[PDB]
Amino acid sequence: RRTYTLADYLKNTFRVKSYSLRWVSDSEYLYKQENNILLFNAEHGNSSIFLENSTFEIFGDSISDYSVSPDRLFVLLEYNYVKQWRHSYTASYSIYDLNKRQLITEEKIPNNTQWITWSQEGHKLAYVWKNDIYVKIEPHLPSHRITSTGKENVIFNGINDWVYEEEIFGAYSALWWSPNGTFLAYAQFNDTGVPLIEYSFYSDESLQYPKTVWIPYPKAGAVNPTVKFFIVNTDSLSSTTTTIPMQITAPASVTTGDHYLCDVAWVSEDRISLQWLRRIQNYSVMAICDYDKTTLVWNCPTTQEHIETSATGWCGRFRPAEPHFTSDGSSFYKIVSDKDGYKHICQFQKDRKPEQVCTFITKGAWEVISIEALTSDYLYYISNEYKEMPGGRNLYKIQLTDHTNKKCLSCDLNPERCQYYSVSLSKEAKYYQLGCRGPGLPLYTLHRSTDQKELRVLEDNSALDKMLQDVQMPSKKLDFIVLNETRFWYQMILPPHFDKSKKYPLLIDVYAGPCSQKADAAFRLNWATYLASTENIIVASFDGRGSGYQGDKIMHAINKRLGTLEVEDQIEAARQFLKMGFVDSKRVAIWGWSYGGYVTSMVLGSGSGVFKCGIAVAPVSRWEYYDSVYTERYMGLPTPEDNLDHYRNSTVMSRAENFKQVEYLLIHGTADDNVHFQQSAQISKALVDAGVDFQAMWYTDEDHGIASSTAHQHIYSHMSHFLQQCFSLR
Amino acid sequence: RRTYTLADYLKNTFRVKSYSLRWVSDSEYLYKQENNILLFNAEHGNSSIFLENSTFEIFGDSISDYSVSPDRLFVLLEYNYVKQWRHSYTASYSIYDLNKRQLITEEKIPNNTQWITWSQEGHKLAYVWKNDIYVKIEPHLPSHRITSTGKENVIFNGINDWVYEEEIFGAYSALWWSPNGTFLAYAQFNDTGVPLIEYSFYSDESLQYPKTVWIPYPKAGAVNPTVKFFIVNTDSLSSTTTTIPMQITAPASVTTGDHYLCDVAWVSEDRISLQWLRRIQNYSVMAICDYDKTTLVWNCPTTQEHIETSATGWCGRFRPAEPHFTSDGSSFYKIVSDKDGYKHICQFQKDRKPEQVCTFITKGAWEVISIEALTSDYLYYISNEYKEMPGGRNLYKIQLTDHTNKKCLSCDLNPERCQYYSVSLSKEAKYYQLGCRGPGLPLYTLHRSTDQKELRVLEDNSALDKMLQDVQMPSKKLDFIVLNETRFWYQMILPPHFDKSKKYPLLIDVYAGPCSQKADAAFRLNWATYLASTENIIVASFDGRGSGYQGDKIMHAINKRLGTLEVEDQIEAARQFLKMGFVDSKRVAIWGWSYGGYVTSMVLGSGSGVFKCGIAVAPVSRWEYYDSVYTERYMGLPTPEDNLDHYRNSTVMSRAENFKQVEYLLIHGTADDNVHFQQSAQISKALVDAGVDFQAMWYTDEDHGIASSTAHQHIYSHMSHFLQQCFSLR
Ligand SMILES: CN1C(=O)c2[nH]c(N3CCC[C@H](N)C3)[n+](Cc3ccccc3C#N)c2C1=O
């Protein structure tokens, strides 16, 4: 008879388990249990201690993470983790010799390492420190410095600069070991002409003069960082003081002007795959390069060029998808839009072929989310094909030799509980673990790839289940409304004993940025849960135009004009919800973070009358303020010769007036390096000039996620009270 | 039957007039009328056009101000005024030749001047541009560069650096022409070792990358700017390319360590008076320097040293009071604390006298506010002696030759309407205009100094009076409560038909910093007027310990320990008010700006339970954050060898916990160069860590005054709504 308290949320009272394993081979995997690394035999529960509760305590309680070498002979022990941006961070490392049973102490690894990683084979290491790349052929042996041009905020070697870490690659890493580890490829970035943004940092109240953090950040239209690609021969290191890395230069069709390095992928050990993108992500090229033994050089013949294009918008979802080559690297499968605009899988040949470079192996009004594994006979992927639910996820598999032999492997399993799967196949797809994130409580089970026999259940949240028993949890409808003759999905977090006859207050939850999906079949316990279980508020999300995985017609609809259709559709959806009866029209709100904050602001400032209040957290206020890679992908260049007009027309401050008819709460982090505060400061200024009262809240020294424990709790408490005041609850 | 709306305040509906004249001689004065400068004859209303409605319009509507040379031959026309700090600003100038009837156009004055001023005599001009001093013997003639060491944020010649402008002198100017204008003395400051503070400036939403403003600002304990005094011979200029200024060096008892230049005052044209203060304002020395014709050097013999001390606190109110020498500069009168701790006037001799340097000309438990004029037979001064009202201001006059012949010249006049006078005597005290700021509507009248005969009434706010007739204006009690057997004055802005039997909500208004006075007999039309007239809120102020002009016992009581007695006494006063009956104890609030924000915060966080809510605008949260000259004057150095403990003990963030029992609104300007935002940012962070919800509001690009039209209106509207919500009104 208890509800789900804001406190339950904030204090993480009801913990949701999972089973994050690490395949060490085609049949064994590692798993952390009570701070013990255990080696398990997929097949028979046969388990075994790999690393002890012990070991980790040597470096006390600061042991941030661990990395076992592929040959399972050593273990990287991470500690002194200091974050910096979304994925970047510096840490200290120790190499524990499993065999000799002790921490290697000789040629230690620098105490401020920016990035480290084993080879794909033995125990080779490559790490970046002070922006320079170093290599250790073996843990006991000394470092061999690979680059020396490294310099803070200027030259990045083997690590990404800010915009590259955030918008191109999903990480800080810009290193790629080859199979067999002969070569080590790496990217170099020059942030020279890139402008600087400089926010303040107050730190402890004991610091008398606040600090200034500067970051080379390219805002829409500004000069971007430049790239260069290199591959250095790792074997020679012992016979030289210095080795000379060979450089690969980007394809001709990309060098005429600004461009980006898209993706790196080793095919074999004498072949590497590189994807390049023009600054206007209209065009993209994937070059396949071969190593020349004779002239000791890498060649990227235009014959193996492969071009990807889009006359509707940009390439890929957030960039060209990644290639998956066969064993002999003669062919590769890659996800690309088909003639109808649906992201599907098609075969390619090393050599390009005059307007027939592809052969689609998938058709349909649905999309392949990702290619999970490629065997000598099978291609395992994940799609939202089943039951026509774009917000659902299932694991499929196609036999190469017979494309008709296509079978879903998760569809039967638990149709009720599981409609959103995550997969994880062993080194050669002999086994595969399934992660049911599905409607019901998450469920983890591993199967034998051959026949799909569910060997056992790794984790079923029974523990959580027994607890949620004494609690009145909300439900979640995931259906679709239909506009202009098209399906547009949405979801609702309905408070407990939801009575379709009564009238509840509505809270729209937004993102709605390009290729986003807020309406899906995944289980969650967030603030929306509390809002429904305790405040009896209906929290709904609506994937409109420019959204999710439903074809380019829907996703590209927003091209060159953000702050348009995706905002409208969001309002339209609220109307549609109202027509559904159980919504108290006099109590409808809308909130959002980042892009969601932008839309929230654009909606509240539309003077549509439909909304009473709204909260925008670290919103974007006009696109010239945001970075280049992201913004330009959808907006082009903010020049008069391109799209300056849509940039200036899609401003938040231009709608200040319409804010008089709305209660608004603007929140923003002081040390936000992604969305610069300048954006909110500009909004607030517009509102003050317009003579519009509103509420604001800054978070001292907080990130773009305002996720530090105390700040996190405070911001949701402050937002909860705002709604209670606005919905006349509390 | 109409109330005083918030709109009345914000739109300055009811304008209050005054009579700001400019004595051009001992019998005539200048006055601006409908943008026409008129010359009036004190005696007979005899008037006459000096400068027309015309002239000013040549420089359009950007004519910021005007300065008439003392020999009334030329007029300085200021325009293109661009503010910078409290008093600094740069403008463009034009010299209008009254006689030749047109704007001088030859050797024009640089388009970005930082400061200009006429000599005391003819038409000599001195101006600073690009941090360097220039002189023009006459308006048509060419500039003569006096310094060339000038450099932005490093070397200041003839103008004050940040701290000096804000805390030592009350302006930007550091130039001093001598009588007869032979010499030009100036100060030079080196901001070299002074640390930098760097806030962000966003500007129009069109600016893609925010700017950064850096200012050499010395926070408590930091390295301070250095000083140097020069006097240059203005007569030689035409016979050289460069003149060499002679330098005066501070007195020996001040040079051992950090010190400051206090005050400059020309005695005759061969004698100058300088005051110096040690960094620890415990000690001060006033040297009288004489010009040596033979060796062409200035001499400041220790025989004419004159020491000022304080074993209770610091020197003077905000620094040593200014000397006023006799015609032959043989003696001078200066306000200093007598044996009882009361600021009074006493006589001095050019030469110091072994512990008898002073002869007090005034006695009493009241203080002399200022020395207005010194005639060959009379000394006119302003005090709060009358009716024992420290919060009152009256013009007195003593006969040098006879210290008994002491007479008040304003006490009688309008005892009902006037209790707060401002004065303004002609070049030789033949006439004197009075500024009744008194209880009633401000009244301006001029008098023939001889017999006090009121020649006429210059301005009586009848226009205003006629208007306020149709409005329900609040009242204002100015009385005193008594604590620990001492009088402590307070004031109350009682709402219209205030009925002593009913119960109203209370709003404490605060500054309460060293030597402040919030309780006085001066008429005002502010936000407090609105609050009482329309919201029915009793706005009250209380001058507790560490306050006003009631002797050093009361003012120094706070020494070395701010955030103590002055905070408590404020709470005490609230209690006392409640005991007066007509206060609704369940609705007591307290707000303040600057130091007041600090106290407001220190009170709200005291957990005394006495207050419900409060507002702090640009508060100080811990003294290490504020500037040196101000902080140190009362707190000493933030070092373990001095007062570090009290600095650390008087923090606002240290009381975060107690804020859970209070609604708090923290407001702060983004471009605040006085109180750095770092201060509010540090407070918000403390409350977030403490798990205390509160309200905040930042003002983009706003000053420490948040005085820009739209901001000013927005901030008061926002605070009004805060109180309305808090007092359950609205
Ligand atoms: C709510 N929200 C959200 O969860 C998410 N993830 C992303 N991106 C995903 C691809 C990598 C990229 N770095 C971030 N965005 C895009 C975005 C748009 C406008 C402003 C800021 C951001 C940022 N962040 C957003 C959101 O708006």
PDB file of C-alpha atoms and ligand atoms in Angstrom, chain A residues 86-87 162-163 165-170 318 510-514 518 592-598 618-620 623 626-627 630 633-634 674-675 679 704, ligand 1:
ATOM      1  CA  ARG A  86      31.778  12.369 -21.289  1.00  0.00           C
ATOM      2  CA  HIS A  87      34.351   9.605 -21.752  1.00  0.00           C
ATOM      3  CA  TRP A 162      36.607  17.621 -27.422  1.00  0.00           C
ATOM      4  CA  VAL A 163      34.273  17.615 -30.428  1.00  0.00           C
ATOM      5  CA  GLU A 165      35.205  12.603 -28.362  1.00  0.00           C
ATOM      6  CA  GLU A 166      31.636  13.827 -28.057  1.00  0.00           C
ATOM      7  CA  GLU A 167      30.316  13.736 -31.635  1.00  0.00           C
ATOM      8  CA  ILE A 168      32.416  11.424 -33.850  1.00  0.00           C
ATOM      9  CA  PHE A 169      33.724   8.571 -31.720  1.00  0.00           C
ATOM     10  CA  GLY A 170      31.918   7.637 -28.567  1.00  0.00           C
ATOM     11  CA  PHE A 318      24.718   9.890 -36.273  1.00  0.00           C
ATOM     12  CA  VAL A 510      11.162  15.318 -24.246  1.00  0.00           C
ATOM     13  CA  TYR A 511      14.311  14.754 -26.231  1.00  0.00           C
ATOM     14  CA  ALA A 512      12.977  14.765 -29.788  1.00  0.00           C
ATOM     15  CA  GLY A 513      16.357  15.469 -31.373  1.00  0.00           C
ATOM     16  CA  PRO A 514      17.313  13.832 -34.663  1.00  0.00           C
ATOM     17  CA  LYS A 518      11.663   8.223 -26.168  1.00  0.00           C
ATOM     18  CA  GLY A 592      13.417  18.250 -21.190  1.00  0.00           C
ATOM     19  CA  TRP A 593      17.185  18.059 -20.923  1.00  0.00           C
ATOM     20  CA  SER A 594      19.647  19.230 -23.591  1.00  0.00           C
ATOM     21  CA  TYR A 595      17.732  19.023 -26.906  1.00  0.00           C
ATOM     22  CA  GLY A 596      14.663  18.208 -24.857  1.00  0.00           C
ATOM     23  CA  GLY A 597      15.227  21.454 -23.000  1.00  0.00           C
ATOM     24  CA  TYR A 598      15.349  23.253 -26.340  1.00  0.00           C
ATOM     25  CA  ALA A 618      20.687  22.969 -19.909  1.00  0.00           C
ATOM     26  CA  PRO A 619      18.733  23.735 -23.056  1.00  0.00           C
ATOM     27  CA  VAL A 620      20.156  24.887 -26.349  1.00  0.00           C
ATOM     28  CA  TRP A 623      22.171  26.654 -32.923  1.00  0.00           C
ATOM     29  CA  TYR A 626      26.253  24.478 -30.060  1.00  0.00           C
ATOM     30  CA  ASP A 627      29.184  22.522 -31.479  1.00  0.00           C
ATOM     31  CA  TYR A 630      26.366  17.815 -34.201  1.00  0.00           C
ATOM     32  CA  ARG A 633      24.905  17.539 -39.463  1.00  0.00           C
ATOM     33  CA  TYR A 634      21.312  18.739 -39.400  1.00  0.00           C
ATOM     34  CA  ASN A 674      28.687  20.660 -23.663  1.00  0.00           C
ATOM     35  CA  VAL A 675      25.799  23.149 -23.646  1.00  0.00           C
ATOM     36  CA  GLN A 679      22.661  29.397 -23.916  1.00  0.00           C
ATOM     37  CA  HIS A 704      26.129  19.025 -18.321  1.00  0.00           C
TER      38      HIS A 704
HETATM   39  C1  LIG C   1      18.245  14.614 -23.866  1.00  0.00           C
HETATM   40  N1  LIG C   1      19.382  14.301 -24.731  1.00  0.00           N
HETATM   41  C2  LIG C   1      20.116  13.162 -24.637  1.00  0.00           C
HETATM   42  O1  LIG C   1      19.992  12.257 -23.837  1.00  0.00           O
HETATM   43  C3  LIG C   1      21.128  13.267 -25.691  1.00  0.00           C
HETATM   44  N2  LIG C   1      22.258  12.525 -26.271  1.00  0.00           N
HETATM   45  C4  LIG C   1      22.678  13.322 -27.278  1.00  0.00           C
HETATM   46  N3  LIG C   1      23.761  13.062 -28.177  1.00  0.00           N
HETATM   47  C5  LIG C   1      23.820  11.638 -28.618  1.00  0.00           C
HETATM   48  C6  LIG C   1      24.988  11.424 -29.615  1.00  0.00           C
HETATM   49  C7  LIG C   1      26.302  11.862 -28.942  1.00  0.00           C
HETATM   50  C8  LIG C   1      26.186  13.349 -28.562  1.00  0.00           C
HETATM   51  N4  LIG C   1      27.360  13.899 -27.888  1.00  0.00           N
HETATM   52  C9  LIG C   1      25.019  13.561 -27.622  1.00  0.00           C
HETATM   53  N5  LIG C   1      21.964  14.459 -27.375  1.00  0.00           N
HETATM   54  C10 LIG C   1      22.219  15.502 -28.365  1.00  0.00           C
HETATM   55  C11 LIG C   1      22.207  16.926 -27.885  1.00  0.00           C
HETATM   56  C12 LIG C   1      21.371  17.829 -28.564  1.00  0.00           C
HETATM   57  C13 LIG C   1      21.320  19.182 -28.189  1.00  0.00           C
HETATM   58  C14 LIG C   1      22.086  19.646 -27.099  1.00  0.00           C
HETATM   59  C15 LIG C   1      22.924  18.771 -26.400  1.00  0.00           C
HETATM   60  C16 LIG C   1      22.978  17.418 -26.770  1.00  0.00           C
HETATM   61  C17 LIG C   1      23.854  16.577 -26.007  1.00  0.00           C
HETATM   62  N6  LIG C   1      24.455  15.831 -25.347  1.00  0.00           N
HETATM   63  C18 LIG C   1      20.948  14.388 -26.332  1.00  0.00           C
HETATM   64  C19 LIG C   1      19.803  15.096 -25.753  1.00  0.00           C
HETATM   65  O2  LIG C   1      19.353  16.180 -26.097  1.00  0.00           O
END
